[PDB]
Every structure is written in C-alpha cells, then in structure tokens.
Amino acid sequence: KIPVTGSGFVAKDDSLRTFFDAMALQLKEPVIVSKMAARKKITGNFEFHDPNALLEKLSLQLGLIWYFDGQAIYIYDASEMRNAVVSLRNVSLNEFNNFLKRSGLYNKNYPLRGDNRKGTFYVSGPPVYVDMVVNAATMMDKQN
Amino acid sequence: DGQAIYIYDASEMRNAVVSLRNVSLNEFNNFLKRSGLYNKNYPLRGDNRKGTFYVSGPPVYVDMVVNAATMMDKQN
Amino acid sequence: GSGFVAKDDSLRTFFDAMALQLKEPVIVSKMAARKKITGNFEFHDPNALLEKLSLQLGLIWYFDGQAIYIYDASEMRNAVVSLRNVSLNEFNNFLKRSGLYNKNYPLRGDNRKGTFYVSGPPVYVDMVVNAATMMDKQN
Amino acid sequence: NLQTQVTEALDKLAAKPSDPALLAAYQSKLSEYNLYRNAQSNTVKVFKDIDAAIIQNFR
Amino acid sequence: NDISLIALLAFSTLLPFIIASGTCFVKFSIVFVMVRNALGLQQIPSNMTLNGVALLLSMFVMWPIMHDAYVYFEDEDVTFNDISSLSKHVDEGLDGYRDYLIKYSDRELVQFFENAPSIFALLPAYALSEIKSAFKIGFYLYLPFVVVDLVVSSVLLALGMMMMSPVTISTPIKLVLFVALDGWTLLSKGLILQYMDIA
Amino acid sequence: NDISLIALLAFSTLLPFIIASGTCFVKFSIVFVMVRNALGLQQIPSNMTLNGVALLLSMFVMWPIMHDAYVYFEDEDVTFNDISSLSKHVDEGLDGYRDYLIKYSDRELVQFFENAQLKRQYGEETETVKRDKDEIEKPSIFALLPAYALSEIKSAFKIGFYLYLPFVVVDLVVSSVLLALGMMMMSPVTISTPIKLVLFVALDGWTLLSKGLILQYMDIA
Amino acid sequence: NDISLIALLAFSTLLPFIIASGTCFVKFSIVFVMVRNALGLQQIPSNMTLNGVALLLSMFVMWPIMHDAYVYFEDEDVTFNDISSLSKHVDEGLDGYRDYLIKYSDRELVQFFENAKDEIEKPSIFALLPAYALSEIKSAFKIGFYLYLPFVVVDLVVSSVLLALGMMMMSPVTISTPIKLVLFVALDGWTLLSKGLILQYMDI
Amino acid sequence: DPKELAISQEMISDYNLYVSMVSTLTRKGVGAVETLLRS
Amino acid sequence: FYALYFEIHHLVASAALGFARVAPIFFFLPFLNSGVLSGAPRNAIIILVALGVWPHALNEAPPFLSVAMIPLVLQEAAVGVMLGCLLSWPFWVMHALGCIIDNQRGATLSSSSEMANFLNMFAAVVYLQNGGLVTMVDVLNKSYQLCDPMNECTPSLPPLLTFINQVAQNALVLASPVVLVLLLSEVFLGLLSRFAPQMNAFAISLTVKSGIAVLIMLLYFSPVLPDNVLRLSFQATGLSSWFYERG
C-alpha cells in the first residue's frame, strides 16, 4: 500500500509539530514544540540516522533554539530567547557550575558568562533554561 | 502510579524546582523508592547531598512530588 | 560553492540564511524587519560581510556569545551611571574576563571614578546598567 | 521643592536621636508637610470630579 | 480651561441643526426630491439615497471651514489682560464661517434683524434665500417634463385614444429619456460648481 | 486569593453585555421582532415583554453550560502552586463555553479573523492559515464571538425570510382583488390585517416555532 | 431572616417584568391597542392611559393570589430545623400561582418544556411561565380578529356606495371614520368588552 | 512616592476623562448622522 | 503594574474611533438596521466588530492624541456613510426594481409598498447565503489599509457624481421586460376601445395588468434574477478607486 523500498519520512506541507513528532522515535524522548515555532512549514524527503546531529543543523537553517533536559526536548524559535542577570550574596559561580555539571543540566552551547569568583553573572538561552537557572540561584542564597 | 494509568499529551509537561530546608535528596528519594512512586523515566535531577533539585514530568507526578516535599519540611 | 539569491526578501528571511555560516542564531528586531533587499550574495567571509552590510544598510549589531542581536540604528540608547565604592577599572576587568567586552562600543569615562557614560544596542545598555547597579548593592 | 528641605533634616536626627530642639523642629516640619500633601490630594480631586460632572450632564 | 469643554461639547449636540439650517444642505436636499416628484415615482431613488448623497456633498463645502476654525483656534495665545481683547479674538475665529454666510444672503433681512455684523441675524435670511434659490432652479428643470407629457397626451387625441389614462404611458417615457441624457450626474455637478471649485 | 474576588466581581459587572453578545439570545430576539414586523403590528405586543419571553428560552437552553462553571470554580483546589498551571486551569475551565462557540459559529467567518488579527499583530509577512487547523488547533476567545454574532444574525434572518413569505402572498392578492374592482383609492392594509392575523392563529406559529428553536440546539428523549 | 430580606427585595425589583410577563395584563394591554388600530386612530387616547386602566383591570383578578401569599407567610412556623422541610414550605406557598398558571397554559407545551399525573407533583414554575405568556398572546390574537371584523364591513360599504356613483377618486377614510366610531358608541362596546374580559377569568 | 503618586494621580484621571470625552463625541457624532438621514 | 491598566485603556479609546467608522453601516444594511435589531444588544456588536478589525496593534498608544478631534469625527463619519452607500448598492437597485413593478400595474396611484419590500428581503437573503458577511467585513478591513486616520482621506468626489445614474441604469435595464408587455397590452386594449367606443377600457386595465405583471416576471424570476445580485455586490478590489489620502 505504501511502496518505497528504503526508510525515511516524506513531508508534504507539514507544520513543524507533525514533523518533529515523527523524529520523536529515533530520538528516544518526546519533543515539545512551542506555539510561535509551529507556524513554519517544511516539505521534502528526510531520513533520520543520527538525529542529535540532524536537529542541530536544522535548528540553524530554519532558525530555532532547542534544549534537552534529560526527559524531553524543547524547541523554540529564535525570537523567544530571553536574558537575565543575578547577584549571589554568599555562593560562587564556580560553586553553582558544579551543581549544574554534577546534576546534568549543564549546556555547553549556552554557558554561564561571569567572573569566576563573584556573585554576579549573565545567563541567556531558551525560556525553560533561564527560569530554571534563575529559580535555583534565588533558592540557594535563601537556603544558605 | 499503581492504581491507574494517566495519559497526557506532550505539550502539558510541567516542571519545577523545590528546596528542602532540613531533609536531603537521598532520603526523600528513598522515601519514593520505599513507597512505589519512583519512575525511572522522569527522575529527580540534582546534587546528591543538597536541598535543591529539578523535577519534570506529568502534572500528577509533579504535583505529587512538590506536595510531598513541602509536607516533609513541615514535619521536620 | 555557496550563496543566497535574494529576490525581495525582508531582512528576517535574509539574515537567518546567514545563521549557518555564522555559527550563532540571528535575532532581528521588528523595526529593522521592514527593510528589503535583492541581489546575489556569497557567504565566504561573513564576519566582514555583516560589518559591511550593517554600515551600508544602516544597522547596529551585538554578539554576546550565544546569539547575534540586530537592531536598527535609531534605537540606540544611552545612560550615565555612578558607582559608589567601586571604580571603572574593576568593572572593565570584569567585562574582559566575562567576554562581554565590545571594542566597537567601549565605556567612556574617567579611569578612577564612579561616573561614566555608555551607549549602544538596547541589550548591551540594559545589561551594563543592571550589572553596574548590582555590584554596589553587594558592596 | 518642599520634599528637599524635608529630606535634609532627617539625617541629623538620624545621627543624633536625642537632641530635644531638633525633634521639635522636625515635628514642626513633618506635620506641616502632612498638612500640605493631603491638601494637594483633596484639591486635585475636586478638579477631577467637576470635570466628570460636565460629561455626566451632557452624556 | 473647563469652560471651553462646555462649548466644545455643545457644538456636537447642536450640530444636527446647524446642518439643518445654516449650510448648503437646504439647497441640496430640496431640488433632488423636487425633480423626483417631477418624474412621479415617489420611492425611486428611495430618499435615503438622496439624503445620503446630499449630506456628503454638503459635507464637502463645510469641511474646509471646519478645518480653518480649529487651525486658528489651536493657537493658545488667546489669554490677555482685557476682557474684550480676548473677546475680539474669538470673533476672528468666526469670521471664517461668517464670510461664507455673508456671501449668499441679501442685504435686506440682515440689517432688519439687527435693528429689531451679527451672526444671529444671518441664518434665517440664509435659509430663506436658499429656499428662494431652490425654487427657480427646480422650475427650469420642471418645464422639459411638462412638455414631454404634453406631447404624448396630444398624440392620443390625434388618434382615437381619448379614453385611456396617459400617466401610465408617459411615466416610463419621461424616465427613460431622462436617464438616457444622463441627467442625474448633470444636475448634481451643476449644483456643486456653484458653491465650490469642484474636482 | 483576595484578588480572585476582584476577578469575580469584575466578571460580574460585565455580565449582561456577555448575554447581549455571546449567548443565543440574539437568535430569539431578532426573529421575535421580525414576527411583529411581518404582521404589520408596530407597538404591540409591547416588546418589553417580548424580551422577557425571548430571554427565558435562552436561559432554558444555556443553563447546563453555565452550571458546570460553578461546580468547576467552587472547587477548593483552584489555587495551584505554579504560574503556568494556574493559567492552564482557567483555560480548561473555559473550554466548555469555547467548544460551544465552535459548534455554532461559521467556519470561514471565524477563519477570517485570525488572518486579520495576525497581520495587525506582526505584519504582512505572517503566512495565512487554512481550514486544516480545525483538527488540532483552537482559536482565541476574542476572535470567535464577532464571527459568532454575525453568523447568528445570518441564521436569524434566514428564519425571518421564510415566515415573511406567507404574509406577502396575502398582501398581493388583496391588492389585486381591490384593483379587480375600481377601488384604487383604498388602503389595502386595513382589509389585509384580519386575514393576516387568521393565517397566524389558525396555523398557530407560536407553539411550533417555539419548539423549533429548542430543537435547533437540543433534542428530546 | 437576613437571606429572606434578599428574596423580599428580589421580588420587588423584579415585579415590573413578572407583571410584564406572567399575568393577564398582556391580554388587556394588547386588546386595548388593536381596538384603536381597528378604529383607524393612531395616538388617541395614548399608550399611557390605556395601560393605566389595563393595569387596574388586571389588578382586580390578580390581587387575591398576591394577598394569600402574605397571610400564608406571616405565620410563625418559618423556623424549621430541616433544610428540605423549609424547601417544602416555600414549595407549598407558590401553589396559588401554580394553580393559576396551569388553568390557562397548554399541557402539551408544558410537557415539552418539562422534557428539557400532575396531581402527585406539580410541574416547575420555570417550565410554564413562557407557555402561559405564549398562550395569552395567541388567545389575544384570536379575540383580536373577532372585534376587528365588523369595522371592515363599514369600511367596505361606503367605498362601494362611492364607487356606485362616479366619484372614484375620493379618499374614504374621511367618511368611514365618522361611521366607524358611532358603531362603537351605539353598541357601547367599551363597557361590555371590559365586562366579558373580567368574566373570562373571574366568575360572577 | 508622594511626588510620583501625585503625578500618576493626575496621569490616570486625565486619560480617563479623555477616553470618556472621545466616546461621548462619537455617540453624538454618529447620532447626528442618524437623525439627518431620517431628516 | 501601570501598563496593564494602560493596555485596556488604550483599547477603549481605540474602539471609539472604530465605532465611528463602522456605525453607519449598521443603519444602512437591510439585515442589520434598527428595524431588525433591538437597542440593548446592538451596541455590544458594533464595538467588538471594530475591535476585531482595527488595523493598529492594540497595546500600542493610538496616534489620535490631540491632533484635531472634532473634524476627525466628521472624517470618519463621512467615510462611514460612503461605505454605507456603496455596500447598500444591490439592495437599493432591487428595492428600486420592485417600486417600478408596483407602480406600473396601478396600486400606487393613491399618491397623486409590500412588493418592493419582498424583492429587497429576497436579494438580502440570497446575498447572505453564499459568502456574504465575509466580503461585507473584508471591505472595511481594506478601508483601514487604505484610509488610516491622521492622514485625512476623503471619499474622492469626481467619481461620486455618477453614483445616482450608476444605480439608475441598473434599475431600468432590470425593469426592462415587464413594462414592455404591460405597455404593449395597454395600447392593444386601446385599439379595442377605438373599435368599441363605450367600453371604458380604463377599468379593465386594472383587472388585467396585475395578472400580467406577475406572469411575465415569473418566466425570468428563477433563472435570471439571482445572478445579477451576486454580480452587483461591491467587491474590495475597487476600494482604491473611491478614496485617496491627503498627506
């Protein structure tokens, strides 16, 4: 009924939510595409054999930012990136980076910009990454 | 969770970060291991001996972990 | 071997095509998204092509380390700030090590004083003012 | 510019909160500023209310 | 300050009667329905259209005068020392409208309504003159409709056709050649050239 | 918690203009003015009571929709712990009203307002959305009720033309039988008014049109 | 007592719509206008002085229903320990209105509204108030055709005696309207239709 | 705050009067066209 | 937290001019006037329709602020009554059609109407079925794209002066075939009055014309009338020819 010999996905005017859910089996995690990034469309014959390398290239050709936090993959478009600056009264940046590296939320594409032994830094990235970094930073000074 | 199977769509997954004032993560995770609510697909991301961690998943699992963590800081 | 063939684009479709040769995503504002362009371009040296186009078209751009923000030139703001118990030299040494030092838009002021002047894109000024006022409260 | 010479007398009592002449002059300042602030608030209020009454009459 | 709000609100309440009596809407509204009565069909073209068109045309004459009033009144340099010195300035704002009104009215009622120039003496002389100007243009449009029925009822007496009604025959003939001369675009533009430099 | 009461009272004040626009009261009111106008009666039957009889049927249909809002919003666990889940809760509370707007509104008239609002929002560069959104995506609540109220004006005038027909068939034959005689200078509406009233009371249009409108929203047994 | 102060105010502020929709005032106020339109009059006498006498006429046969709810609700046993027994007690008060409505409403239409005998339980008060108002407007239309009918004959007979002569281009409204109202004052139809309108509900 | 609330005290009230003024003029504006079309 | 109050407050100011643009279309249209719509839910509709079609973004400040407000209202009313008289085109010619057919057969000679109301309702419904309100809303959505305020656009006078004959030549050719049969029947009867003198053929003319005027229009009522209704509906592409902005 579906005669093609090989393996691949054929998209005819797909709308970026039905396209990434078809990649959500080769990637072993569910994909969450935002509301503004679902108005763009894509069509063509695609194939997935290393989708963590394919998602990086298509996030630059289409214009997207993505984040994988161990359970799911969040995808936003480029005009939703937000910024923040926070001050730590009694812990260091190198102490907070050991918490991020040891826990597993440390992302080497969006690192933390600041002085190595201070309280202030500058974080920027996806909207699910920033509101976590800010919320853990204001939840460690009140604990200490 | 042991009595039923909840099913949501992928766009309803919520997440939270909660701070335990006087109880470690390794003790609360043993409370979940002893109860039966431990789900290895959505584990608790955080430092092993601290009070802060990051949890994400279905809304019935997040609203259970947050409520059972803030009801274990009030007992201590 | 590469290149974009522009036929009446709108400067948001266009600069996202350069977001692969530049290794960062590009974010263009909505007042700078009305200007249009045509022509055959060629992305072989994009860090000098973006600089030449931003002066012919009339644009301001800022790269912080993750993305490239592009505003139009009529949105440049300026502000003067004063630091009580810190001088200009440790804040400039903070920016040199934090990677937020932009040589095109440096900090204008006296070398050992609290008052100085800053002007640039609205993501650079809003970072510099908040970082300047978040060190004096810590001290 | 009344708030300036209000805000210039609080600091010497902050440095010396036991001088009897200063708190007497400070109370003499602050009750008069209390009389000034609600007077301006009550007087702008009538100029709003009577301006609302014309459109209430003509609507 | 706030006393300016009463006058600038009362103008909006009294506007439907300044249009009813002070402007060229009087002349425009009458001759349309008069030449409709010339044709004898009282509900075509369905008088809401005649009041729809003649309102837009009478808007076009009053509109520069309205913009000229508040261009001048935008200058807030009106406050002075003398009570009458500010009073002459408000009269200077109204001479832009008054010069429209002094142009068309006659010199017989305007001093008759000042001994018994002022603004309030001019409006009933204006609307009375415009009605008198409306009738003589309606009469000259009336005569070519009182010759075409006269010939068709004559041909019935030329034949043996005396006993039939002539209005059931003459009314389509009067309507067809009138629209065939494209007269409805003629008498409208022949009126708007009188008041303004149209187009 | 306290400002939830402010949101309740502010919802309470804007209530009857929602009944003026959002509900199906607009179908009953228009067709009831039309059955007054088609009979030729001007003042009677004194439309202050015709608003009331048209309101009571609309409340009689709207009651199961609005009743689930009370039991959903008097829950003791309205207050959540996160800012996005609390904004999710009022959406899933409003979904029972919203799919009611979806069922009874027009397809393309709703579809026109999203394309008209997006080019106002971002600009012309936003690409248009087609019919194929309907299977997954829901429109906003402020882009529905304009196209709802226009579609219900279309359906009410659709009903109003049909029962306007059996009266003008009467009003032409009376104006023809009077001109069958030489009675040209005679007002035919004063002869037409009895037999216009008989054709509605012998047909009893009130007690079958009233059942017809409730059948256009709900069913029996 | 404090909550009953709400419902006592809530009747009073809602009275000009319940009296607008749930009584025989709609039938009196409707027939008193079409008798003017039957006579070919427009603004005579008014819409105010016809509503006034229609209000008092409807206030006669309606007052004893309103009067019994007072004397029933003045009694001392409004204190009940049970929720539902008070709900029964207020259900037992409205039976004066329910027995009034069922007499003049249609059983099939109220059965239709009931879907969306009557001796064991009475149907609900919201299930039949439109059915009452929709039955009154129909019956007032039916009685409106009847007294419309004799004035058509005087409208026709003078137009035929004018067409019997050659004067065909003569407006007969200036002649029929004198002959219209002498038919209504020699009958003295005003004092008798108000009689039979009262007798339609209240017996002698 | 005594000077900032006072300048926002005028700032709310004058813009509320401006929105009522612009809405009452639109009502008498189109209502004059309504009565002139009835004439 | 001042901008949350300001966002609804810039909106309620923006809807007033939106009301002033679209209010005199709800007086002109046959299925939307005050005769068909009550008073209480009318003004709810007219506000939120202009709120769903207003061209500028809602959170921004409107450019209305103290430029020239009383003449701005007369601008927006003048373009509103212009859009009303263009949108009510095919109902006006159809109501003019029925007045001619009523007038030729007699039945209107008490001057020196119900039939013309019947065609006006009929062309209202057949316009309302296929499309209808989508093109009725589209022309006022394009009017904000070509007549944005603080630019003083006008209804472009030199093509307005042919508006009355533009509907008149659509009225006469639509009333063409039935007045020709009524007129030829009258002179055919008049030759019989010339062949029999005391017939009084004027009285017979009222009896026979009312049957002819419905019979001849029954042959072309079904296949010929309703397509001219969709043809005469004014479409949005011609909105440029009726307006122009002044600076």
UniProtKB/Swiss-Prot annotation, chain C:
Domain of life per record: Bacteria
Localization per Swiss-Prot or TrEMBL: Cell outer membrane
Phenotypic consequence of gene deletion: Insertion mutants are hypoinvasive in the HEp-2 cell assay.
Family: Belongs to the bacterial secretin family. T3SS SctC subfamily.
Subunit details: The core secretion machinery of the T3SS is composed of approximately 20 different proteins, including cytoplasmic components, a base, an export apparatus and a needle. This subunit is part of the base, which anchors the injectisome in the bacterial cell envelope. Forms a stable homooligomeric complex. The complex is composed of 15 subunits.
Functional summary from the UniProt entry: Component of the type III secretion system (T3SS), also called injectisome, which is used to inject bacterial effector proteins into eukaryotic host cells. Forms a ring-shaped multimeric structure with an apparent central pore in the outer membrane.
Stated name of the protein: SPI-1 type 3 secretion system secretin
Source organism (scientific name): Salmonella typhimurium (strain LT2 / SGSC1412 / ATCC 700720)
Full protein: residues contained: 32 to 170 of 562
Swiss-Prot record, chain D:
Inducing factors: Negatively regulated by PhoP-PhoQ.
Effect of residue 46 to A: Shows a specific deficiency in the secretion of the translocase SipB/SctE. Shows fully assembled needle complexes. Is able to invade cultured epithelial cells
Sorted UniProt keywords: Protein transport, Secreted, Transport, Virulence
Effect after changing residue 49 to L: Shows a specific deficiency in the secretion of the translocase SipB/SctE. Retains the ability to assemble needle complexes, but is not able to invade cultured epithelial cells
Inactivation phenotype: The null mutant strain is non-invasive.
Impact noted for substituting residue 56 to E: Can secrete only early substrates
Impact reported for residue 29 to L: Has wild-type invasiveness
Effect of residue 56 to A: Shows a specific deficiency in the secretion of the translocase SipB/SctE. Shows fully assembled needle complexes. Is able to invade cultured epithelial cells
Activity control summary: Binding of bile salts, including deoxycholate, to the PrgI:SipD interface may inhibit the T3SS function.
Effect of residue 57 to A: Exhibits constitutive secretion of substrates. Retains the ability to display SipD/SctA at the tip of the needle filament
Subcellular locations according to the entry: Secreted; Cell surface
Effect of substituting residue 56 to M: Cannot secrete the translocases SipB/SctE and SipC/SctB. Retains the ability to assemble needle complexes, but is not able to invade cultured epithelial cells
Outcome of substituting residue 32 to A: Exhibits constitutive secretion of substrates. Retains the ability to display SipD/SctA at the tip of the needle filament. Does not yield assembled filaments in vitro
Swiss-Prot record, chain G:
Protein name from the UniProt record: Surface presentation of antigens protein SpaP
Amino-acid biosynthesis is among the record's keywords: no
InterPro entries, per the entry: T3SS_IM_P, T3SS_YscR-like
Keyword flag Cell membrane: yes
Family (UniProt): Belongs to the FliP/MopC/SpaP family.
Gene Ontology annotations of biological process type: bacterial-type flagellum assembly; bacterial-type flagellum-dependent swarming motility; protein secretion
Subcellular location field: Cell membrane
Swiss-Prot/TrEMBL keywords: Cell membrane, Membrane, Transmembrane, Transmembrane helix, Virulence
Function, as annotated: Involved in a secretory pathway responsible for the surface presentation of determinants needed for the entry of Salmonella species into mammalian cells.
Organism phylogeny: Bacteria, Pseudomonadati, Pseudomonadota, Gammaproteobacteria, Enterobacterales
Membrane topology: Multi-pass membrane protein
Main subcellular localisation: membrane
Native source species: Salmonella typhimurium (strain LT2 / SGSC1412 / ATCC 700720)
Ranges that cross the membrane: 6-26, 53-73, 143-163, 167-187
GO cellular component, one term: plasma membrane
Domain of life: Bacteria
UniProtKB/Swiss-Prot annotation, chain H:
Protein family (similarity comment): To S.flexneri MxiI.
Function recorded in the entry: Required for invasion of epithelial cells.
Name of this protein: Protein PrgJ
Originating organism: Salmonella typhimurium (strain LT2 / SGSC1412 / ATCC 700720)
Residues of the full protein shown: 63 to 101 of 101
